[PDB]
Amino acid sequence: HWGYGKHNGPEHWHKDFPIAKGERQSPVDIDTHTAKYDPSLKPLSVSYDQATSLRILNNGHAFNVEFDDSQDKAVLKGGPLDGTYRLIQFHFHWGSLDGQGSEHTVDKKKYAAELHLVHWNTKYGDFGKAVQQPDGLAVLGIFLKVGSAKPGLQKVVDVLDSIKTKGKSADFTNFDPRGLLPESLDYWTYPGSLTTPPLLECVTWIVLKEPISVSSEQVLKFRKLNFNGEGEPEELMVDNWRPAQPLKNRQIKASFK
Ligand code: NI
Ligand code: NI
C-alpha cells in the first residue's frame, strides 16, 4: 500500500498516513546559510564498543542490520539529547544513480545514499512505546558519496546476495558500526519524523556534516537488491528515499561554527 514505485510512492502516502502533511515531517533540506550554531549543544557521545549485531533483514523497503537493544550496549547520548538512546538497527536509503539517493539534502544537494542509525529513548522501555513520544527516537544520519571504498561497509555488501528478496534474513553477528562513521562528529539537528509510514513525529534528527565515501562497486551491489519477494518479478531496490518536506515552524541548529 506504500512503497517507492510508480503508483504508491511518497506523493501518495498522505492518503493512508495524513501526518505525511504534518508540522514536523522529515527529511528536510539543510540550508547551511540559515542553520545557526547553537552553543547550548554538546558533542555527540557515540558509545558502540559493546554493540551486539544479530541479523540482517530485507524488509521489502530497505535492509535492516539489527542489534540487541535489551541492554545499554550501543548507545547515543549527548548532543541535543537528554538521556540514553539505544541502537536498534541501521539501514540505508539509496538511489538508482549516483546523483540521488539521500533523503536529507544540503543546500539542495542530493548525496548517493544516506545511512540511518536508529536509536530509542530508554525512558520509554521499548521501541513501540518510544515512537509514540515526541522525543522517542534519535536517528544519526550520515551521507554517502561515491569515491573510495569504505572498508567497514564491505561485510554488509558481501551478505546482500543472501538477502536479495523481501523477507529474507541472515545471521549478522559481530559487526562493528563504528566502521561506518566519518572522522568528524560535527552535526546539524532538528525535530522531525520517521521518513517511512507511519511517519510519526517522534525523531530528534542528528545529521553529520562530513559524508563517508563508498565505492562504485559497493553501491552497485546495493542496487542488486530486490523490493519483491522470491519467485516474483524483479523490482530492483533503488530510489528508496522520500524527498525533502517543508521545514515549517522549525529551526535547524548546528553543533559547529
Ligand atoms: Ni502495502
Ligand atoms: Ni531511514
Resolution in Å equals 1.2
Ramachandran assignment for 78, one of left (phi > 0), alpha (psi -120 to 50 degrees), beta (any other): left
182 prior amide bond cis, ω within 30: no
Ramachandran assignment for 82, one of left (phi > 0), alpha (psi -120 to 50 degrees), beta (any other): beta
Cell of 80: 541535543
Cell of 23: 508540522
Cα(83) to ligand 2 centroid in Å equals 22
Cell of 66: 539489527
CA–chain centroid gap for 139, Å, is: 7
Cα(129) to ligand 2 centroid in Å equals 19
Cα(1) to ligand 1 centroid in Å equals 3
Q: Residue 237: count other Cβ atoms within 10 Å of its Cβ.
A: 25
**Which amino acid is present at 168?**
K
Query: What residue numbers does the annotated binding site for substrate cover?
Result: 195-196
198 prior amide bond cis, ω within 30: yes
Q: Is 7 a catalytic residue?
A: no
CA–chain centroid gap for 146, Å, is: 18
